[PDB]
Amino acid sequence: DTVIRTHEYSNKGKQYISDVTGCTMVDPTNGPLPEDNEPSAYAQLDCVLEALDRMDEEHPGLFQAASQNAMETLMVTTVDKLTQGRQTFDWTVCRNQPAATALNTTITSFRLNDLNGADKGGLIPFCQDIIDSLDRPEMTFFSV
Amino acid sequence: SMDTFITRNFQTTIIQKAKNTMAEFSEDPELQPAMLFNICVHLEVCYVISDMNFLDEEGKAYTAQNLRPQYEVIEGMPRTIAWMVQRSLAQEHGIETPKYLADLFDYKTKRFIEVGITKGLADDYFWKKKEKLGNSMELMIFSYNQDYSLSNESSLDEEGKGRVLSRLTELQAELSLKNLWQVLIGEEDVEKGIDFKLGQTISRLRDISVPAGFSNFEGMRSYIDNIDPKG
Amino acid sequence: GMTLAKIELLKQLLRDNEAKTVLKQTTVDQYNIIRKFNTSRIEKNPSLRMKWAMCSNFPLALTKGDMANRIPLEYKGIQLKTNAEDIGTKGQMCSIAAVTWWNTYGPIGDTEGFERVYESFFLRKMRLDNATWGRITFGPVERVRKRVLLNPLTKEMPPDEASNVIMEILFPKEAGIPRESTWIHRELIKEKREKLKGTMITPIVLAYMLERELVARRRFLPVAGATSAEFIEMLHCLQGENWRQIYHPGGNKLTESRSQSMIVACRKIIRRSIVASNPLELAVEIANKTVIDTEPLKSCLAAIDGGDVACDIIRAALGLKIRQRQRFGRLELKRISGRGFKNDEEILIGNGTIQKIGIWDGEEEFHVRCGECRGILKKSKMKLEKLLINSAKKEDMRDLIILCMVFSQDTRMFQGVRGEINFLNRAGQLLSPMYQLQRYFLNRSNDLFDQWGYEESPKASELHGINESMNASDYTLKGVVVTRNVTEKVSITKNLSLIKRTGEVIMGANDVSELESQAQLMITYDTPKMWEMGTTKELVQNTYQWVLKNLVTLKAQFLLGKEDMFQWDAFEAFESIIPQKMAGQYSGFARAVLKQMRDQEVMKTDQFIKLLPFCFSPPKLRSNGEPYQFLKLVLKGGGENFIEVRKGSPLFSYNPQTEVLTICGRMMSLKGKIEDEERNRSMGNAVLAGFLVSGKYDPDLGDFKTIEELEKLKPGEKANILLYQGKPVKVVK
Amino acid sequence: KRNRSILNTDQRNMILEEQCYAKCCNLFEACFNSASYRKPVGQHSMLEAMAHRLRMDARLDYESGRMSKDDFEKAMAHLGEI
Amino acid sequence: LSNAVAKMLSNCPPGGISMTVTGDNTKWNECLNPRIFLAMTERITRDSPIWFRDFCSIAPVLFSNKIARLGKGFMITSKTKRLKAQIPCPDLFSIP
RNA sequence: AGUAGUAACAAGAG
RNA sequence: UAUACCUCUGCUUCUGCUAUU
RNA sequence: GAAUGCUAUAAUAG
Ligand SMILES: Nc1ccn([C@@H]2O[C@H](COP(=O)(O)OP(=O)(O)OP(=O)(O)O)[C@@H](O)[C@H]2O)c(=O)n1
Ligand SMILES: [Mg+2]
């Protein structure tokens, strides 16, 4: 239902085939403005930016002030931070699992593909390994 | 560069255990080899002071079955191990822990030992480090121009004191023989930028993850950065 | 000799090549990840799963040990435990009956240290045990939502500092780098370590027990005149919305909390006394019967050496040596010469925003003190002039200079505000800009020093200036000097002004702080009609309630005597929550609208009730003889504290359909106390003074006239009025 | 007691994986009592950390007189094997 | 919210009408777009260094190419035979 | 049958 | 086949994010 | 005459 409805409000947008996943992608953004009051996903970048500019004017320095904090946080943030999110999806077994396990599986899996970024302890170098893992031709993992 | 040099001079023990010390301080071993060599020498000097120094069950120093040395090598051991060792020693023998991390500790003396290698004068560098410690650790300073400045109570014997000054000049000569002595002389400064580079895949995903009327992400970035959408 | 066993077990564990590789690969960091590793999906309906699982044979899991084996398999035909070992504990499973058995016929363990371990709680109990309960009161309570401390602490520290202290107590070896903190709590570390020494309770518990009484649990709650933790803990029993309960806790109460509340009492007395003729009379009347928790205000003011203007005014009023002694958190001053004029002004700060601050005028001299360091300060409007100090402790000297720099409000101090400084709270509440600027520059000092400027040191006898590092230096901070060298009978006017024996005044009730705030300890007024010191909404409700109560008489007396029943002690209190600069104008308006109803036959009891209270403040008419005209009457407090003339308002509205008056939410029936003609009788008449309805909206007259356009009309001129959405009326003068 | 639905299905194997990590951590906590309270920090091997601590503990247990020669030799010998 | 209401209430022009629209948005999740969330980060981190601008940009980029798993599947049954069976999501278009 | 209600249970497994 | 009138199981037959912390 | 910012296995809200 959600999958249908999401695309039902985007169908008048720009539809194309992802040359990465090979999937059917639909892009409503900067699309034709609605003719009625049926849910519209066709947001206009210009208007989203203009809105944010006014917000930035009304609250001066807040964006960089936050960005600073959010950035300085990430640098301190360890990997174990991920082990506090109930049932996370584990790609190694294609089932949900405890956050702490779902991570462990990924760290153990990554090591086999020569990805030890986790071991450094900070979240950033572990994150680097995730966006790197996409460029691996094959991905190898333990399964009992 | 220093890359090929340290492989010949120092063993993998000293190479790696230093690169761990550098890693914990979060500075690249290759982008600052001057800093690597300093800690390598700093570590190699410390091991020589506690190499053959052994204690018997009676409680007297002797030269080398038996597994209990006279000194305790703190330099090399990771921070949280080093500090555990340092605290464990202080609390056991019953003295206050120094606020700074020590290099060595003599089990017979029951005192902490701070080691320091300098380029100019060893006598000057003794009074420089006396400001921080004062009398928390019994300093033991050395330099490459055959100049030693130990504490009033120095346990280091005549046969021991030589090996240090020998290896100090032996390496200092080997750096001059390879024309790499000049590499350590010149100043080296670099702030370690927190670089997070994107791969090929994720970069492509980003380019297809853009609003309509954009060739690639670079476009969306520069559009957002530059143009003002008032009205 | 536990060490050997561990090493012997490590050899056993390292024979499992799976465990070996886990230990060899998993970093000390990653311990945190693999510790939380389990099969168990998180139980989403535990309330159910428990209720169900309790009906099973063996729901519980023993820890495999010699103690587990002391429990028998069955007792008098009751299966206590099974052979089958739990997946988790790898020990025998058991029924809830097992616990009940152990607690009955189990071995008797050593409960030594327990009380010292769980002292935190035993005190929590001891406070209730050695408490005294007063009377319950039924009446309106305006609860304010504020961030408060939930549990009294042994000593307050940041979580980081707190944790580091706990490490020093329980886990000496695994402490890491020794911090300043270690030395700062050396007494508490040793004290706790000596108390927890002989105990068999698990260190991890002792950790959380210390954490409970060192780490501050500070959360938002709806409170009313009780902020003190030892009150907050009992907040559920202290008050409701519509009832209050007097409760004196036990143990001890802080001199600071005794002080800070003692101020609010005086401020609240003065605030209310100002309205009556002979304020001193009422000020004295209340003050004598004002109790701070269990301690009389007079006794408290006598006992405590410190407090604000109000404290001194009330001290004088009672007859006590007024201490012009002053505080600014850490800094504590005492005036030698000067007179301060607090003017609210828009200050630009270093980060580049405009903050409203109360700036003090005139050149004043104070005896500044900070710990073991003392000094003499001299300041003018937003400029420090000269600061003499002693060479006591290095940090105590360093703090005094920063405190004096901030206190002076120097335009240089405001320039050195670089970074994020919050004057507004996460919940959009006001924080004291001076007390936040004080709090900011105590953390970042090097900015202030560099943003101030230096100059040549003094070359006098015992004067030798100090630089940034607080050492006898050549360059000293612009107007700072270090030296080797470290009342009068007043009377108070009935109108509350402290006059010298010469004639010059030192304080007045016009000089006290306008800011009401939540008293730390419970403030009680042992005179009947204590509600008079209450909040806007409390006073508003209690007043209109008293109007409704005596409406029978008050309405009749109005139809005989004109101004006989305008002067009532309830309406006096009510004036103290009216803005003084509109009080008279409102009375001027209201009395005219009332008299207009009485004389011209057109009555309206709901309006009479609404306006009658305003008719106390001596009337203030316009220069052309006619009264001021109003749409809403704003009162002291939030932007919701106002009475609408034409419509209803968050304080006051009448429902004619039900004949129900609604006051601050509380519903009262006007059935029986209502005239028959009123229902059909329009409101249009009792809305403007000297204005009455003629007909209905006349398009010829045009749009609806404003207060101004109405006030600027010649008698017998028609106009279009709107009472409320969809009630147009044609009103004439 | 833990829901034992897992005993029937092939997921069984995970209990050994758990009770492995459990063994590793539990012992680590016997070496570092602080680990239970505050998060231990280090990018070095757990074994490395555990070894040194036990070495110091043993040495100072011998020097203090909490441990005997027979036991200390066994300690340094057993730790030697690692 | 009590403080917010108090001000926005009292700030109302005298004579003018203050109105509160008790509001709720429909299909909040379905309608909002990742590529908009990408723009938001890019505009919010304008003064942030190159790496952190990019770091933030990933989460939206993943969401703008994300794949939704279709749960367990659909159960088909014969009442006559009293047989039930789960059809896996991969085998949805196996049966007519 | 029934519960229940946009899809399940009315035992499941070796 | 068979053991099986036996044996094991009763959230694990996919339970998320963000606040109140 | 102000502060102190956090960070559950429950429940509620979206
Ligand atoms: N259990 C929930 C409820 C709500 N939400 C979040 O809150 C939003 C608002 O939920 P709601 O108002 O209940 O529904 P809508 O998304 O508005 O859907 P509808 O069009 O049916 O009103 C959701 O989109 C989602 O972002 C959520 O994450 N989890
Ligand atoms: Mg909705």
Q: Are strands A95-98 and C218-223 parallel, antiparallel or unpaired?
A: unpaired
Report if residue B179 sits inside a domain: yes
Task: Give the DSSP letter string of B177-214.
Answer: HTT-HHHHHS-------------HHHHHHHHHSS-SS-
Number of H helices, E strands in chain A: 5, 4
Q: What gap in Å lies between CA B28 and CA B31, rounded to an integer?
A: 5
The C1' atom of G15 and the CA atom of E64 lie apart, in whole Å, by 25
The verdict on the CB of residue E30 being under 6 Å from ligand 1 is no
Task: Give the DSSP letter string of A112-144.
Answer: HTT--GGGG-BHHHHHHHHHHHTT-SS------
In our burial notation (b when 16+ CB lie closer than 10 A, e otherwise), range C701-710 reads eeebbeeeeb
Cβ A16 vs Cβ B210: under 8 Å: no
Contact B83 C28 (CB under 8 A): no
Structure tokens at C510: 């016009």
Residue C616: Cβ within 10 Å count = 23
Q: What gap in Å lies between CA C614 and CA C593, rounded to an integer?
A: 11
A69 inside 8 A of chain E by CB = no
- Which nucleotide is nearest to D9 if distance is taken from CA to C1'? F13
3-class state of residue D4 by DSSP: coil
B31 phi and psi angles, rounded to 5 deg: -80, -15
3-class state of residue C229 by DSSP: helix
Structure tokens at C159: 């979580």
Cβ A141 vs Cβ A105: under 8 Å: yes
User: Which range of residues forms the domain containing residue D20?
Assistant: 1-82
How far from each other are the two terminal CA atoms of chain A, in whole angstroms? 36
Q: What gap in Å lies between CA C317 and CA C492, rounded to an integer?
A: 6
Q: What gap in Å lies between CA C145 and CA D36, rounded to an integer?
A: 37
Q: What gap in Å lies between CA C14 and CA C640, rounded to an integer?
A: 72
Q: Is the dihedral of CA C355, C358, C364, C368 positive or negative?
A: negative
Best probe of the C interface among A107, A112, A123, A124, by most C CBs < 10 A, is A107
Place of tokens 């409007």: C381
Q: Which residues pair with B63 in a beta bridge?
A: B53
CA angle C587, C590, C592 (to 5 degrees): 105
Q: Are strands C497-499 and C491-492 parallel, antiparallel or unpaired?
A: antiparallel
> Residue A20: CA atoms inside 13 Å, Cβ hemisphere, count?
19
Could you tell me how many residues make up chain E?
96
| Contacts of residue A136, Cβ cutoff 8 Å, sequence gap at least 6 | A113
Per the structure, how many domains does chain B have?
Answer: 1
Task: Give the DSSP letter string of chain E.
Answer: -HHHHHHHHHTSPTTS---------SSHHHHS-HHHHHHHHHHHTTTS-HHHHHHHHHHHHHHTS------SEEEEEETTTTEEEEEEGGGTTS--
The answer to whether the beta carbon of residue C219 comes closer than 7 angstroms to any atom of strand G is yes
Q: What is the DSSP secondary structure assignment for residue C442, as one 8-state letter?
A: T
Q: Closest Cα partner for D48 from C702, C10, E76?
A: C10
- CA-nearest residue for atom 9, ligand 1, is E28
Q: What gap in Å lies between CA A131 and CA A117, rounded to an integer?
A: 12
Name the minimum distance, in Å, from the CA of D9 to any CA of chain A: 14
Q: What gap in Å lies between CA C673 and CA C678, rounded to an integer?
A: 11
User: Which range of residues forms the domain containing residue B27?
Assistant: 1-192
Place of tokens 């035993």: C122
Q: What gap in Å lies between CA D68 and CA B169, rounded to an integer?
A: 44
Q: Closest Cα partner for C602 from C682, C667, C544?
A: C682
| Contacts of residue B51, Cβ cutoff 8 Å, sequence gap at least 6 | none
Q: What gap in Å lies between CA B74 and CA B96, rounded to an integer?
A: 17
> Residue C149: CA atoms inside 13 Å, Cβ hemisphere, count?
17
CA angle C443, C448, C453 (to 5 degrees): 155
Cβ C733 vs Cβ C716: under 8 Å: yes
Q: What is the maximum alpha-carbon separation in chain D?
A: 54
C-contacting residues in A 43-102 (Cβ below 8 Å): 60-61, 65, 78-80, 83, 86-87, 98-101
| Contacts of residue D18, Cβ cutoff 8 Å, sequence gap at least 6 | C37, C38, C39
The one-letter amino acid code at D8 reads: N
Structure tokens at B39: 């800690």
Q: What gap in Å lies between CA B34 and CA C157, rounded to an integer?
A: 42
3-class state of residue C732 by DSSP: strand
Cβ C422 vs Cβ C431: under 8 Å: yes
Q: Closest Cα partner for C2 from B55, D27, B90, B16?
A: D27
Report if residue B220 sits inside a domain: no
Contact D43 A80 (CB under 8 A): no
> What are the C-alpha distances in Å from C130 to residues C248, C249, C522?
9, 7, 17
In our burial notation (b when 16+ CB lie closer than 10 A, e otherwise), range A41-72 reads bbbebeebbeebeeebeeeeeebbeebbeebe
| Contacts of residue C710, Cβ cutoff 8 Å, sequence gap at least 6 | C629, C688, C691, C719, C721
The answer to whether the beta carbon of residue D5 comes closer than 7 angstroms to any atom of strand G is yes
Cβ C534 vs Cβ C143: under 8 Å: no
Q: Is the dihedral of CA A41, A47, A50, A54 positive or negative?
A: negative
Contact D52 B57 (CB under 8 A): no
Q: What gap in Å lies between CA C327 and CA C311, rounded to an integer?
A: 13
Solved with? X-ray
How far from each other are the two terminal CA atoms of chain E, in whole angstroms? 56
Report if residue B33 sits inside a domain: yes
Q: Closest Cα partner for C524 from C140, C150, C261?
A: C261
Q: Closest Cα partner for C389 from C449, C462, C292, C300?
A: C462
Q: Residue C219: enclosing H or E segment and its boundaries?
A: strand C218-223
| Contacts of residue C700, Cβ cutoff 8 Å, sequence gap at least 6 | none
Q: Residue C246: enclosing H or E segment and its boundaries?
A: strand C243-248
Place of tokens 């309906």: C45
Best probe of the B interface among C177, C179, C182, C183, by most B CBs < 10 A, is C177
* Rg value, chain B, Cα: 25
Number of H helices, E strands in chain D: 5, 0
Contact C163 D79 (CB under 8 A): no
Cβ A80 vs Cβ A66: under 8 Å: no
Name every chain D residue with its beta carbon within 8 A of the beta carbon of C39: 2, 6, 11, 14-15, 18
Report if residue B217 sits inside a domain: no
Contact E48 A20 (CB under 8 A): no
D-contacting residues in C 203-232 (Cβ below 8 Å): 203-204, 207
Place of tokens 């002030």: A65
- CA-nearest residue for atom 17, ligand 1, is E26
Q: What gap in Å lies between CA B102 and CA B112, rounded to an integer?
A: 6
Cβ C135 vs Cβ C246: under 8 Å: yes
Structure tokens at C345: 């002004």
The verdict on the CB of residue E31 being under 6 Å from ligand 1 is no
Q: What is the DSSP secondary structure assignment for residue C573, as one 8-state letter?
A: H
Q: Closest Cα partner for C523 from C205, C214, C300?
A: C300
Q: What's B36-93 look like in SS3?
A: HHHHHHHHHHHHHHCCCEEECCCCCEEECCCCCECECCCCCCCHHHHHHHHHHHHHHH
Cβ B204 vs Cβ A20: under 8 Å: yes
Q: What gap in Å lies between CA C201 and CA C708, rounded to an integer?
A: 78
Name every chain A residue with its beta carbon within 8 A of the beta carbon of D43: 119-121
3-class state of residue D75 by DSSP: helix
Q: Which residues pair with C663 in a beta bridge?
A: C652, C666
The one-letter amino acid code at C323 reads: R
Q: Is B27 exposed, middle or buried (0-12, 13-18, 19+ CB in 10 A)?
A: middle
The verdict on the CB of residue E3 being under 6 Å from ligand 1 is no
3-state helix, strand, coil in chain D (%, to 5): 75, 0, 25
For residue E30, which ligand has an atom nearest its CA? 1
Q: What gap in Å lies between CA B34 and CA A44, rounded to an integer?
A: 55
E20 phi and psi angles, rounded to 5 deg: -105, 120
Structure tokens at A141: 């993992």
Q: Closest Cα partner for C687 from C620, C616, C611?
A: C611
| Contacts of residue C233, Cβ cutoff 8 Å, sequence gap at least 6 | C124, C127, C150, C151, C152
Report if residue B227 sits inside a domain: no
Strand G nucleotides below 7 A of a protein CB? 8-18, 20-21
Angle between helices C203-212 and C159-170 (to 10 degrees): 140
Per the structure, how many domains does chain D have?
Answer: 1
For residue E29, which ligand has an atom nearest its CA? 1
B103 is annotated as contributing to ligand binding: yes
Q: Is C547 exposed, middle or buried (0-12, 13-18, 19+ CB in 10 A)?
A: buried
CA angle C425, C430, C434 (to 5 degrees): 105
Place of tokens 């996460």: C426
Number of H helices, E strands in chain C: 27, 33
Cβ B90 vs Cβ C176: under 8 Å: no
Structure tokens at E2: 């009590």
Cβ C501 vs Cβ C489: under 8 Å: yes
Best probe of the C interface among B85, B97, B131, by most C CBs < 10 A, is B97
Q: Is C373 exposed, middle or buried (0-12, 13-18, 19+ CB in 10 A)?
A: buried
Q: Closest Cα partner for C83 from C68, C96, C67?
A: C68
Task: Give the DSSP letter string of D43-56.
Answer: SSBHHHHHHHHHHH
Cβ B110 vs Cβ B95: under 8 Å: yes
Q: Is C387 exposed, middle or buried (0-12, 13-18, 19+ CB in 10 A)?
A: buried
**Of ligand 1's atoms, which has the minimum distance to the CA of residue E27?**
20
Q: Closest Cα partner for C623 from C705, C692, C711?
A: C711
Structure tokens at A100: 């702490």
Chains near E (3 or more Cβ pairs under 8 Å) = A, B, C
Q: Residue C525: enclosing H or E segment and its boundaries?
A: strand C523-525
Give the start-end residues of each E strand in C15-77: 60-61, 74-75
Residue C272: Cβ within 10 Å count = 22
Q: What gap in Å lies between CA C58 and CA C84, rounded to an integer?
A: 10
Contact A120 D13 (CB under 8 A): no
> What are the C-alpha distances in Å from C90 to residues C42, C63, C323, C463, D23?
20, 7, 71, 77, 12
Task: Give the DSSP letter string of C322-389.
Answer: ---EEEETTEEEEEEE----EEEEEEEETTTEEEEEEEEPS-EEEEEEETTEEEEEEEETTEEEEEEE
The one-letter amino acid code at C69 reads: N
Please give the distance, rounded to the nearest whole angstrom, from the Cα atom of residue C92 to the centre of ligand 1. Answer: 46
Q: What gap in Å lies between CA A27 and CA E64, rounded to an integer?
A: 9
